[PDB]
Design a protein around this ligand. Structure first.
Ligand SMILES: CCCCCCCCCCCCCCCCCC(=O)OC[C@H](COP(=O)([O-])OCC(O)COP(=O)([O-])OC[C@@H](COC(=O)CCCCCCCCCCCCCCCCC)OC(=O)CCCCCCCCCCCCCCCCC)OC(=O)CCCCCCCCCCCCCCCCC
Ligand SMILES: CCCCCCCCCCCCCCCCCC(=O)OC[C@H](COP(=O)(O)OCCN)OC(=O)CCCCCCCCCCCCCCCCC
Ligand SMILES: CCCCCCCCCCCCCCCCCC(=O)OC[C@H](COP(=O)(O)OCCN)OC(=O)CCCCCCCCCCCCCCCCC
Ligand SMILES: CCCCCCCCCCCCCCCCCC(=O)OC[C@H](COP(=O)(O)OCCN)OC(=O)CCCCCCCCCCCCCCCCC
Ligand SMILES: CCCCCCCCCCCCCCCCCC(=O)OC[C@H](COP(=O)(O)OCCN)OC(=O)CCCCCCCCCCCCCCCCC
Ligand SMILES: Nc1ncnc2c1ncn2[C@@H]1O[C@H](COP(=O)(O)OP(=O)(O)O)[C@@H](O)[C@H]1O
Lengths: 120, 344, 80, 47, 319, 51, 52, 63, 163, 139, 97
């Protein structure tokens, strides 16, 4: 799919071109989810290991909520880029090959005559 | 194992898939497959129980002949194109061989007989490696060659696997074999979308790995190879009962959990490509897989099976804990669905 | 350590040599005045034919004739 | 107490300091990345 | 905990082993004054003398070590064993199955001490010798045939993994004299036990336990008179040559795995809880849930060792 | 906020909820006042029709 | 390929010898060295779907 | 706050959803075209490195 | 002759058909040792002295010999008379002729013409296999390293299996 | 292969002979394949016993093939309506019934009729609506 | 060559049919398995030789080196089997059912 694109960075995570895109707001609901996803991992661990669920490993709880979140910003930063490349790529083609994607005129309903099936 | 040997083997079992993935000269891809075959056989017979020798001798013969067939495809290509690698021009039969062969190493469809049996005689641990770090290698070879393979065969092996996996699983009561059967099924979905959108194969795999790896480390936490054995989970370790429940329903496609995404996007991609015949039948028997998953749910969680008196003794003693990976791979798996858009 | 080699030279007087020449051969090439020539005496042999380049007048070194003073002259291999 | 003492009774103080300290390095790199990022984004584009 | 890291970096059992380091069990009839010999031999070579496995031996083993309530410890009574043989509820089989689990824990704890500290082990009766009680119980009406099969299946599944006793001692006193020994010790439950049942216990040892182990380990038979003379018996042990037996092949890289097993009690008895549903063994879900949901609420047991504040654990918020 | 930290959980959800539902508006504010039926011209000293 | 650890690392352990026109020992060109060149300098920058 | 807010909010919701819908369909058409055409950055399958050929003086005439 | 290779090729198929009828473990080893001899010869036909002899040196006496060796140690229980197999084998000997025959009438063909040694430098040296196999040490030094690990970790794989 | 395809080329309900012949072959082919898997796995006791099973499966399958072909063609003939899933359903209905008989079970005939017929009907619809099976990737 | 290349290929298929149709002894199979490696080695060497593609001769041998160990593993499994059953018949390998 998107691989084989000109300029593809053969093994890079997020090419610098992704600098142009806005950075993910740290409180983006998603990163906040990853946070909660993380807290739960932590709590779950405590549970499976039979420790006071919430009052234990308060250091770990932090490692978790802060590892998942850290991961998020840098992942979302990329997935965001990938999607952004997709448009660059998609929109460009629509133009470079214009005839294939022609603008269409939609007749005002006045003109079009969709048939009327009566419910009766 | 003299720790040195452990290192050499483990390195090979790990250099095996990695060479396959990194190289482009098919030959070097073949030897990557060859190493994996050589490295896995020692670990398979670690207990050296009579069942084990049977396992390895089957795994080895099935793996070896497939390896030879893959080499024949490379040898034939070399004469139809001087290149040592499949190209647009490749004779169709040349590629189909590679599909069958690689579908034997991965154990898909009508070649699904070896896997359930080797998964039954190997330890739970080596079971995981045999199921998930040995599927990465062959799949890599296929994913690389996707543009050229046949849409018809893949689909047939895909559908067959789904059915065989499901039907096989319904009867099985041994856990190792229930998982072997599930893997056949999931492996099927993966190979269904390969011709159309390889990138989704790599999602339907990771999710399978992030689902199966927690599931097996669960089976071994109590080292239960029987459902009856996993059913007394409530006494041996009560907390894992909650997540074991969700992970197994996640392995099947039920909608709130992460497991729906692989099936959902594979169905979306197949309908985008118009296989609304094939996709429909697959999704339907996919529902058979959940039936045997939920039957296990019943025994392990929703209903409490009776336990032996000595179970009280095992409770007393501190239970060696499950590694952290269980949690991080249980949650990222049971509930990431709210984050699907970025996964795909 | 040094007197452990003395019985290992009296008894076991084989592996000593095999790990004394295994290595000696790794240090003789790195420390010899003449190891440079092996990749050079082996680089001079014209097994295939030397294709001549077209003249432009922009090439002073290229020896025009086999006997010009110019070019790869090996008065080295001689009396190496 | 316990006849067989726990292995975890007094905290593994290393595990605290690499767990706490690691997380505080994560943030200081993460928050840094964001503001740094925001800038790169602003200058690379109009503002 | 012990791991390949530790094994890779020193910590090898081989370098911790010495002549006095062996697994020595002393087995006898219900009353062989065995206890004394063991503690005596123990005193001789500093051997850690493990006491005979008990109903609450596991509870003394785990956590606080205070004796557990009977139902928490599997509801087994040796006392009821005797007063009500061939009981409807089968307390006798449940007693035997818990006893096998207790010695499995004791033998494994013994092996862990042996491979770590290197001090040799004296544990009285062993798992290998436990079968004589069941053989005698099946010989009379105490246990039915399947009950026997269930114990044998657990024995075949778990006992082979552990290495055999280095040597076994046999303090034998005749069927009649143990009953008079029984007659003067005070408990009334030990009294009135079947002479034929005691006949079947010692006969089972002589017929099966001593010959079987006579190759797996150095059996040292001692008559009562040799007994009560720990010095002499101790002398003989120091005299026997620990050669014949499977222990000879235990290289360091082999011991490591055995150590990591005994190091994990939850595995030692993993096959002791196999889901074979014979009626006596079955907890039952409603009773079992209550017993678990009650044992787990005992102070210091709710959470893992080190994390339950009731008994005074602290630092939980950083553990 | 002691022993009452479990009574202010749900209520707080409400506030956060209202904070988002009034934030969603802020996003979907195109056609702020550009709709046909309701396109009045800004009254003096009024920033925007609906906030 | 699937994981291009080779291009990234810049190493070329597996690419130098994939086609008949690759460097042959002692510069002994193989049969067809002429064609394969003409058939791969053609299909360079043009993807397969249009190299076919 | 009023009838004005929901009417204008609903029109904004429809514009985002209408524009998302047109683009999703155009993707499917562009993706059909580049796969078969192979004239666009997506679906550009590889052929061997030109960098690995050898246009150097060989040992025989006529390469 | 010109059918220098075909005939041989035909013999190679005969030996493979013998291994395929799965004759007694060691009677067929001979079969391999026969077709290995045959394959050794064909490669020599094309000028691959080194590559050829190599097979006669490693697969022939190294691999195969060790194979039967083990046969003797085990799986040479030498408990269907191979003669029955020879009977069938004879059938195939000519049954293959049938397969070839259809294409024989259909006809390349008429034995073997210039369907070997397509192009060879009528002048020149260094053109000889073993110069190519020695690229393990120049310009193809990754095949050499991975083969090493095969054999090297082979030692460790075998002993571990044996133990 | 130009053969099997012929079934579709001529309008349905017409040239039943060809239809029945083609349908019978496909069933029979499936019979062979099915028997083969049935003999390779779950082998027989004697060669003859297995030859029989091959025959049994082949004939049963050939039969379901025939009646399907015959019923659908005739149903269309008699009904005069060439394009109608119902024709096929009646055919599939019949086919299942043959299977049921060969297996000597009324119940199987039940599931057989419904399931088999439905499937065949869907084939007709599929052809009528130009549904594509095993499609090439066109993304 | 085109003619011969056929014989070798069918040799590999006849060896294929062999390994996919067992009969008693396993050592037969492993032996057959090897018949393929010889056929592959011969075919790879043959085409490399008539393509004058010397850069590829490394492969004909890498194929053998990997195939030899592959077989080493195969035989150790075989010895392991006639140590646990002592008869090496594919017949008794059915415990896993
Ligand atoms: C509780 C802890 C809260 C901590 C709050 C910390 C402070 C804070 O974050 O406040 C500021 C911060 C400011 O947010 P904002 O960006 O200004 O909000 C405006 C957005 O436009 C408003 O957000 P948006 O709608 O633009 O977000 C985009 C996206 C965001 O996507 C998500 O974040 C999904 C979160 C799902 C939860 O929307 C979606 O949610 C799409 C997915 C909807 C659900 C799809 C899956 C449904 C089936 C599965 C349901 C879940 C099953 C779990 C598995 C089973 C478990 C048993 O608030 C948040 O970001 C968090 C909002 C709540 C997140 C979910 C919490 C649960
Ligand atoms: C989208 C919704 C999906 C479905 C959500 C609701 C179902 C959640 C999954 C439930 C699956 C298991 C069902 C059966 C569980 C049986 C639990 C049990 O038997 O009790 C013991 C167990 C462990 O016990 P322990 O915590 O150690 O202490 C008590 C010892 N007796 O006790 C425990 O396990 C306690 C912890 C249980 C887990 C708590 C989960 C609470 C419910 C989660 C709802 C999430 C809703 C999300 C909604 C999203 C909307 C977008
Ligand atoms: C549609 C696709 C169909 C594909 C073929 C399917 C064939 C039927 C499959 C199931 C057959 C019924 C099960 C029993 C088959 C059987 O027993 O034969 C195995 C065969 C003989 O060897 P053995 O295993 O000892 O069997 C003796 C039995 N008394 O073992 C062998 O034959 C070993 C290999 C030797 C014979 C082949 C050697 C290669 C040359 C073949 C030439 C042509 C042979 C034609 C027959
Ligand atoms: C005018 C009325 C026309 C009705 C047509 C449909 C019913 C025709 C029934 C004919 C007789 C069938 C029969 O008797 O066999 C029942 C069948 C097999 O039953 P079995 O247990 O094998 O014993 C039969 C012993 N002679 O057992 C079966 O599998 C029966 C399957 C067909 C059932 C048909 C009726 C279903 C009604 C569903 C109603 C849903 C609301
Ligand atoms: C989705 C909802 C679908 C609802 C369909 C309802 C149909 C109801 C029909 C009446 C009930 C018939 C029934 O349930 O019988 C079950 C049958 C009982 O067994 P019996 O018929 O004696 O044969 C045993 C063969 N092993 O058990 C069997 O016979 C099972 C084996 C026969 C299967 C027959 C169906 C085959 C379909 C092939 C379709 C190919 C395309
Ligand atoms: N498996 C068993 N079944 C029944 N009773 C057992 C078992 N094992 C040990 N016992 C009990 O142990 C008692 C003997 O212990 P005893 O010799 O009094 O201990 P000590 O060594 O302190 O003297 C017997 O009365 C017997 O009932």
């Amino acid at each position: 799919m998107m691989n084989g694109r000109p300029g593809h960075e053969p093994l890079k995570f997020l090419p610098d071109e992704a600098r142009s895109l806005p950075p993910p707001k740290l409180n983006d609901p998603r990163l906040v989810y990853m946070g909660l996803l993380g807290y739960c991992t932590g709590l779950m661990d405590n549970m499976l290991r039979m420790r006071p669920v919430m009052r234990a490993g308060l250091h770990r709880q932090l490692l978790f909520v802060t590892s998942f979140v850290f991961a998020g910003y840098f992942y979302l930063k990329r997935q965001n880029y990938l999607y952004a490349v997709k448009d660059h790529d998609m929109f460009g083609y629509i133009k470079l090959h214009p005839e294939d994607f022609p603008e269409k005129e939609k007749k005002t309903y006045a003109e079009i005559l969709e048939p009327f099936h009566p419910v009766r | 194992m003299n720790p040195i040997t452990l290192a050499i083997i483990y390195f090979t079992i790990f250099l095996g898939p990695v060479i396959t993935m990194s190289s482009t000269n098919l030959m070097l891809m073949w030897v990557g497959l060859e190493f994996s075959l050589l490295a896995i056989i020692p670990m398979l017979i670690n207990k050296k129980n009579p069942r084990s020798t049977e396992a390895a001798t089957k795994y080895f013969v099935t793996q070896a002949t497939a390896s030879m067939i893959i080499l024949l495809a490379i040898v034939l290509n070399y004469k139809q194109l001087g290149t040592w690698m499949f190209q647009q021009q490749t004779n169709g039969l040349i590629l189909n061989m590679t599909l069958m062969a690689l579908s034997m190493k991965l154990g898909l469809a009508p070649f699904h007989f070896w896997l359930p049996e080797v998964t039954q005689g190997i330890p739970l641990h080596m079971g995981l490696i045999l199921l998930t770090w040995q599927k990465i290698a062959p799949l890599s070879i296929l994913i690389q060659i996707y543009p050229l393979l046949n849409s018809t065969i893949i689909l047939m092996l895909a559908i067959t696997s789904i059915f065989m996996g499901a039907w096989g699983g319904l009867n099985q009561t041994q856990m190792r074999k229930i998982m072997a059967y599930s893997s056949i099924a999931h492996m099927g979905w993966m190979l269904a979308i390969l011709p159309y959108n390889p990138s989704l194969t790599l999602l339907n795999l990771m999710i399978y790995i992030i689902l199966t790896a927690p599931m097996f480390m669960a089976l071994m936490l109590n080292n239960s190879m029987t459902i009856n054995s996993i059913s007394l989970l409530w006494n041996k370790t009560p907390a894992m009962l909650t997540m074991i429940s969700l992970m197994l329903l996640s392995l099947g496609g039920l909608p709130p959990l992460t497991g729906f995404l692989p099936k959902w996007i594979i169905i979306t991609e197949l309908m985008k490509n118009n296989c609304l015949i094939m996709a429909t039948l697959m999704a339907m028997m996919a529902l058979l897989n959940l039936f045997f998953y939920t039957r296990l749910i019943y025994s392990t969680s929703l209903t409490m099976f009776p336990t032996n008196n000595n179970s009280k003794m095992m409770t007393h003693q501190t239970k060696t804990k499950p590694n952290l990976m269980f949690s991080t791979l249980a949650i990222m798996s049971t509930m990431t669905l709210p984050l699907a858009p970025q996964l795909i | 350590i040094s007197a452990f080699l003395k019985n290992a030279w009296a008894k076991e007087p084989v592996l000593v040599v095999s790990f004394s020449v295994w290595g000696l051969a790794i240090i003789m090439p790195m420390i010899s005045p003449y190891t440079k020539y092996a990749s050079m005496i082996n680089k001079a042999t014209p097994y295939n034919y030397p294709v001549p380049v077209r003249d432009d007048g922009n090439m002073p070194d290229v020896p025009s004739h086999p006997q010009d003073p110019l070019g790869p002259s090996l008065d080295w291999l001689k009396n190496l | 107490f316990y006849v067989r003492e726990p292995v975890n009774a007094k905290p593994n103080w290393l595990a605290v300091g690499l767990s706490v300290g690691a997380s505080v390095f994560m943030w200081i790199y993460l928050i840094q990345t964001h503001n740094e990022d925001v800038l790169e984004y602003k200058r690379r584009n109009g503002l | 905990r012990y791991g390949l890291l530790a094994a890779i970096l020193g910590d090898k059992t081989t370098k911790k082993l010495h002549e006095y380091s062996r697994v020595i069990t002393v087995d006898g009839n219900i009353c062989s004054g065995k206890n004394k010999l063991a503690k005596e031999i123990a005193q001789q070579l500093g051997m850690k003398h493990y006491p005979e496995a008990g109903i609450q031996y596991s509870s003394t083993t785990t956590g606080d070590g205070r004796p557990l309530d009977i139902e928490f410890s599997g509801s087994c009574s040796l006392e009821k064993f005797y007063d009500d043989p061939k009981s409807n509820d089968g307390n006798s089989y449940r007693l035997q199955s818990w006893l096998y689990a207790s010695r499995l824990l004791q033998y494994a704890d013994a092996l862990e001490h042996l491979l770590s500290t290197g001090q040799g082990v004296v544990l009285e009766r062993s798992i290998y010798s436990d079968f004589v009680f069941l053989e005698a119980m099946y010989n009379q009406g105490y246990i039915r045939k399947q009950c026997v099969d269930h114990y044998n299946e657990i024995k075949r599944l778990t006992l082979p993994e552990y290495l055999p006793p280095h040597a076994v001692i046999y303090i034998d006193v005749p069927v009649p004299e143990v009953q008079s020994r029984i007659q003067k010790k005070g408990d009334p439950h030990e009294m009135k036990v079947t002479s034929a049942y005691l006949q079947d216990i010692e006969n089972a040892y002589k017929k099966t336990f001593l010959p079987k182990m006579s190759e797996m380990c150095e059996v040292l038979v001692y008559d009562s008179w040799e007994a009560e003379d720990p010095t002499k018996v101790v002398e003989d042990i120091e005299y026997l040559k620990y050669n014949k037996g499977p222990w000879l092949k235990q290289d360091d890289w082999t011991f490591h795995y055995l150590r990591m097993l005994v190091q994990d009690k939850t595995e030692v008895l993993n096959y002791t809880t196999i889901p074979v549903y014979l009626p006596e063994i079955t907890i039952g879900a409603h009773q079992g849930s209550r017993i678990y949901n009650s044992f787990r609420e005992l102070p210091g047991r709710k959470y893992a060792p080190g994390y339950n504040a009731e008994v005074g654990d602290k630092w939980i918020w950083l553990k | 906020l002691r022993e009452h930290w479990v009574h202010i959980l749900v209520p707080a959800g409400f506030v956060f909820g209202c904070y988002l539902d009034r934030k969603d508006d802020e996003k979907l504010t195109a056609f702020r006042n550009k709709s046909m039926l309701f396109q009045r011209e800004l009254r003096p000293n009024e920033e925007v029709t609906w906030k | 390929p699937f994981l291009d650890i080779q291009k990234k690392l810049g190493i070329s352990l597996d690419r130098h010898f994939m086609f008949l026109s690759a460097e042959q020992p002692y510069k002994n060109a193989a049969r067809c060295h002429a064609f394969e060149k003409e058939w791969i300098e053609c299909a360079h920058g043009i993807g397969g779907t249009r190299a076919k | 706050d009023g009838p004005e807010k929901n009417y204008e909010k609903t029109l904004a919701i429809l514009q985002i959803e209408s524009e998302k819908a047109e683009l999703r369909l155009k993707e499917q058409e562009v993706r059909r075209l580049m796969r078969a055409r192979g004239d666009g950055p997506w679906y550009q399958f590889p052929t061997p490195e030109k960098e690995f050929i050898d246009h150097s003086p060989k040992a025989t005439p006529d390469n | 002759m010109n059918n220098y290779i075909f005939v041989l090729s035909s013999l190679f198929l005969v030996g493979c058909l013998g291994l395929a009828l799965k004759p007694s473990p060691i009677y067929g080893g001979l079969g391999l040792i026969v077709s290995g001899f045959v394959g050794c010869l064909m490669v020599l036909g094309f000028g691959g002295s080194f590559l050829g002899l190599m097979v006669f040196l490693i697969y022939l006496g190294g691999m195969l010999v060790v194979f039967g060796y083990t046969t003797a140690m085990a799986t040479e229980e030498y408990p269907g008379s191979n003669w029955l197999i020879l009977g069938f084998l004879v059938l195939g000997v000519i049954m293959e002729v049938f397969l070839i025959c259809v294409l024989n009438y259909y006809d390349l063909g008429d034995g073997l013409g210039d369907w070997l040694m397509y192009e060879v430098d009528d002048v020149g040296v260094m053109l000889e296999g073993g110069i190519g196999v020695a690229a393990m040490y120049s310009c193809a030094t990754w095949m050499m390293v991975v083969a090493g690990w095969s054999l090297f970790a082979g030692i460790f794989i075998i002993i571990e299996i044996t133990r | 292969k130009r053969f099997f395809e012929s079934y579709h080329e001529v309008p349905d309900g017409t040239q039943c002979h060809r239809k029945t012949y083609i349908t019978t072959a496909l069933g029979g082919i499936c019979g062979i394949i099915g028997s083969a898997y049935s003999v390779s796995l779950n082998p027989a006791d004697s060669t003859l016993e297995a030859v029989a099973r091959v025959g049994r499966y082949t004939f049963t399958a050939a039969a379901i093939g025939a009646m399907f072909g015959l019923t659908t063609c005739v149903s269309a003939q008699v009904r005069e309506k060439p394009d109608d899933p119902l024709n096929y359903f009646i055919g599939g209905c019949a086919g299942g019934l043959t299977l049921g008989a060969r297996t000597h079970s009324y119940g199987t005939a039940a599931m057989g009729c419904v399931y088999m017929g439905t499937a065949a009907a869907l084939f007709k619809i599929g052809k009528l609506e130009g549904w594509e099976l095993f499609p090439t990737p066109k993304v | 060559m085109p003619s011969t290349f056929f014989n070798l290929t069918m040799a590999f298929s006849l060896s294929l049919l062999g390994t996919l149709m067992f009969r008693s002894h396993l050592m037969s199979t492993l032996l057959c398995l090897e018949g393929m490696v010889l056929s592959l080695f011969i075919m790879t060497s043959v085409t490399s030789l008539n393509s004058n593609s010397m850069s590829s001769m490394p492969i004909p041998i890498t194929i053998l080196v990997f195939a030899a160990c592959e077989a080493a593993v195969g035989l150790a499994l075989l010895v392991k089997v006639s140590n646990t059953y002592g008869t090496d018949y594919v017949q008794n390998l059915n415990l896993l059912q």
